Design a protein around this ligand. Structure first.
Ligand SMILES: NS(=O)(=O)c1cc2c(cc1Cl)N[C@H]([C@H]1C[C@H]3C=C[C@@H]1C3)NS2(=O)=O
Ligand SMILES: N[C@@H](CCC(=O)O)C(=O)O
Ligand SMILES: N[C@@H](CCC(=O)O)C(=O)O
Lengths: 129, 380, 86, 90, 197
């Protein structure tokens, strides 16, 4: 489980849409929107939540969604909690008989899915427009 | 189909070289009038209308006025400019100005069409949330509390079956009875009351109208739009209709006909048909209804007529002024019209080539039942 | 007056609670607490082995019956008295 | 005299009907009233998925604290009689 | 088995309650005879023609077999199917209550249907076409200025505007222009009566 998050954060074929690679299909990702099927190809640029011609100023609901999307805390949280559950389940070999440590592990796995599942929801929410 | 090229032209000879509506109608009138006849084709391939400063007609009637041709049996519009200097017999076919546009796509409902009123991100996020709930309702109901963890009936497999029971709203076998068990059982109940109701509210929306509404069928929006350019045949009586408009929307039609860059007037009708097919909504063509009938009755079947006719003009058998044959010609047409001959000829060419042959007028009523083809998916 | 014409606003994150006004969702919650106390009151009311705990409806279960009955979901328990079924 | 003579015939009104309507029309001016239906988007129903996960984190919290309370280890009949006394007063 | 039959139920039942109040109030139109082929398969209703008429002289000169049957119906039919005026043929249809048909010209049958009481209906396509023409004696001097004048009205749409004016400004029945507009009502017990049965 710890592999498939840290792969998915550090890879960038998240979305197949059409958009500008320089500033027209996109090798679009969670951090770096990249581009395929163009005259220029293989250049990956930094993504940008845009305040220039924004049309969401003084929104209560969007200003929460801008922060959570482009600073993707929830898939980052879904890595660390999945990593923290990995250390408690690694610590059952040595320093065992504590008999509490895998519940402390297993809640961190279940939490890491609840972090992961809402990281999908904020991702589908923001890119729609 | 007024004159069509016969397949065996180089085999056959004379008037048998051609086959068409007028070719049949010429044979019918020559029986009743009793004259030998020899068909020809105009060299212009055009309709005779007037030159600037010259009045010399370039087309069939210019071959008819000037002693070259004797009888003109053709889809020739009886307009005032022609009849003041040629004769017409009484008309043989009724028609008017009408529009050809491409019906774009058929797009009947697929077999998994019932899943449509929710998007496929939602169904994916439902299944993720269904697993996400049922693992949490397991984890709560199985802790260190003799074997008093067993007092909760919720293993994980009863947990998947509870939340499936709560989602499909088909009741449930048991119920959580802890405090934190009833929280997850309560929230998932509030979840499924929104989602299943958002399904049934939106599926009522798909079950009245799921089709296409025609963009320019009112014919005043057709004159309106600057994206949808509209044209007609050059030196055609449709163009000659709008040059003397007295209706205000028809006054605006001629202005964009005049002020289109480049010329939307196409050199033939068949090339004008092929322009709208290439356009895909970008261009419209204006043509006669009986000329727009045969376009629908041929493959690729993607041409259809919107609105009624814009007017009511007619076609005529044409003769020169003072042509002595033209009066038994004129008595022939009233004989052919009453004997059902002309309608039978209007039948034959315009149905038997109904390769498309659909006659799909449409079940217009929005109070129409579900069909088994619409809900075939859940049985699969 | 001319202004730059605004964008057509998306619905909020609480768009589910829009078909019923704010004044009703407060009175649905108030009717919920009102029912579950009365359903707690009618049963578990000195019946005459020990009759004081014959019914299964505590205060906490009777909240769960009224929450279950509102969400169109069946529950395990049922009132089972002439004054409690009303 | 000519201004009214146009206006009483509605000529000026017909000329006002002609020019301000035949120009460039935005789409939501005459036929923008017509409506249509579409599938629900996840941005439309997103709060319900928040509240579900918002409830699941809460339920795991309360289930944890009843374990920390029970592994560590209470009303009195008198103090609730005082508590129903103060609550009736307020 | 149960889990899929649940999801089967969720789709079928929610599709059943989609437009259910509409189907209990369909308000169908029966239209028993249309499309002159089906005049000849349901020939028991009594046809009607005008005395001294082109509709007479058309069916007197019958050639198509569907057209020949309906006149050889009317000539031996009892009593005399002919009416002396249009107001006699219209009124004979209205009394007989779906039992007497009258075959008549397309524009009067357009006109009668528009005019209230509006209890009649124009069904079927036109079985031919034929024209009204302004007529002069053979060899008249006025024939040539009139023959040029007919198109000269028609190319301007004057005749069409005069046809737009007169056939629409008269008595309009309610279901002709604004009868398309709809509304909702409570369910009646005659709509749901089979469920109580
Ligand atoms: N079937 S059709 O509409 O092509 C059609 C149309 C017409 C036909 C005959 C047929 Cl088959 N003949 C009539 C004729 C009868 C008299 C009235 C008009 C001319 C002389 N002209 S029409 O009304 O234009
Ligand atoms: N039949 C028509 C063709 C051209 C047009 O439709 O304007 C004519 O003779 O004028
Ligand atoms: N207008 C018709 C009247 C007779 C009929 O309707 O048959 C005619 O001139 O002959």
């Amino acid at each position: 489980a710890f592999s498939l998050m840290t792969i998915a954060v550090g890879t960038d074929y998240w979305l197949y849409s059409r958009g500008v690679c320089k500033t027209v299909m996109t090798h679009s990702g969670l951090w770096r929107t990249c581009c395929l099927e163009g005259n220029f190809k293989g250049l990956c640029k930094q993504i940008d939540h845009f305040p220039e011609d924004a049309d969401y100023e003084a929104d209560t609901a969007e200003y929460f969604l801008r922060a959570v999307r482009a600073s993707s805390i929830f898939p980052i949280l879904s890595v660390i909690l999945l990593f923290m559950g990995g250390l408690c389940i690694a610590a059952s070999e040595f320093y065992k008989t504590r008999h509490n440590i895998i519940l402390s592990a297993g809640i961190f796995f279940v939490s890491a899915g609840l972090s992961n599942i809402i990281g999908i929801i904020v991702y589908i929410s923001a890119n729609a427009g | 189909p007024y004159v069509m090229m016969k397949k065996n032209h180089e085999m056959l000879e004379g008037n048998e070289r051609y086959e068409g509506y007028c070719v049949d109608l010429a044979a019918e009138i020559a029986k009743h009038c009793g004259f030998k006849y020899k068909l020809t084709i105009v060299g212009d391939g055009k309709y005779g209308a007037r030159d600037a400063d010259t009045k010399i007609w370039n087309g069939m009637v210019g071959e008819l006025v000037y002693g070259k041709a004797d009888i003109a049996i053709a889809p020739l519009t009886i307009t005032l400019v022609r009849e003041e200097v040629i004769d017409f017999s009484k008309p043989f076919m009724s028609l008017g100005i009408s529009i050809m546009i491409k019906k774009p796509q058929k797009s009947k409902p697929g077999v998994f069409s019932f899943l449509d009123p929710l998007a496929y991100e939602i169904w994916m996020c439902i299944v993720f949330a269904y697993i996400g709930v049922s693992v949490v309702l397991f984890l709560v109901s199985r802790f260190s509390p003799q074997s008093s963890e067993s007092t909760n009936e919720f293993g994980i497999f009863n947990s998947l079956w509870f939340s499936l029971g709560a989602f499909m709203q088909q009741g449930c076998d048991i119920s959580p009875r802890s405090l934190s068990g009833r929280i997850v059982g309560g929230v998932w109940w509030f979840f499924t009351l929104i989602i299943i109701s958002s399904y049934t509210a939106n599926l009522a929306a798909f079950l009245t109208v799921e089709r296409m509404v025609s963009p320019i069928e009112s014919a005043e929006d057709l004159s309106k739009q600057t994206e949808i350019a509209y044209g007609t045949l050059d030196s055609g009586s449709t163009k000659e209709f709008f040059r003397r408009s007295k209706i205000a929307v028809f006054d605006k039609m001629w202005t964009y006909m005049r002020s289109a860059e480049p010329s939307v007037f196409v050199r033939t009708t068949a090339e004008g048909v092929a322009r709208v097919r290439k356009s895909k909504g970008k261009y419209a063509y204006l043509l006669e209804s009986t000329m727009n009938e045969y376009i629908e009755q041929r493959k690729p079947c993607d041409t259809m007529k919107v609105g009624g006719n814009l007017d009511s003009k007619g076609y005529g058998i044409a003769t020169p002024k003072g042509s002595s044959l033209g009066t038994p010609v004129n008595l022939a047409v009233l004989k052919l019209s009453e004997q059902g001959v002309l309608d039978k000829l209007k039948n034959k060419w315009w149905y038997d080539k109904g390769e498309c042959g659909a006659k799909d007028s449409g079940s217009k009523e929005k109070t129409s039942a579900l069909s088994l083809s619409n809900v075939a998916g859940v049985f699969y | 007056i001319m202004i730059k014409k605004p964008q057509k606003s998306k619905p909020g994150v609480f768009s589910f609670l829009d078909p019923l006004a704010y004044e009703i969702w407060m009175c649905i919650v108030f009717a919920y607490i009102g029912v579950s106390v009365v359903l707690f009151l009618v049963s578990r009311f000195s019946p005459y082995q020990s009759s004081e705990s014959t019914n299964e409806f505590g205060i906490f279960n009777s909240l769960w019956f009224s929450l279950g009955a509102f969400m169109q979901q069946g529950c395990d328990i049922s009132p089972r008295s002439l004054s409690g079924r009303i | 005299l000519a201004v009214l003579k146009l206006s009483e015939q509605g000529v000026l009104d017909k000329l006002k009907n002609k020019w301000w309507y035949d120009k460039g029309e935005c789409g939501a001016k005459d036929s923008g009233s017509k409506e249509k239906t579409s599938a629900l988007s996840l941005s439309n129903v997103a709060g319900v998925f928040y509240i579900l996960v918002g409830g699941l984190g809460l339920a795991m919290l309360v289930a944890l604290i009843e374990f920390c309370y029970k592994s560590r280890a209470l009303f009195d009949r008198g103090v609730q009689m005082l508590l129903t006394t103060v609550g009736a007063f307020a």
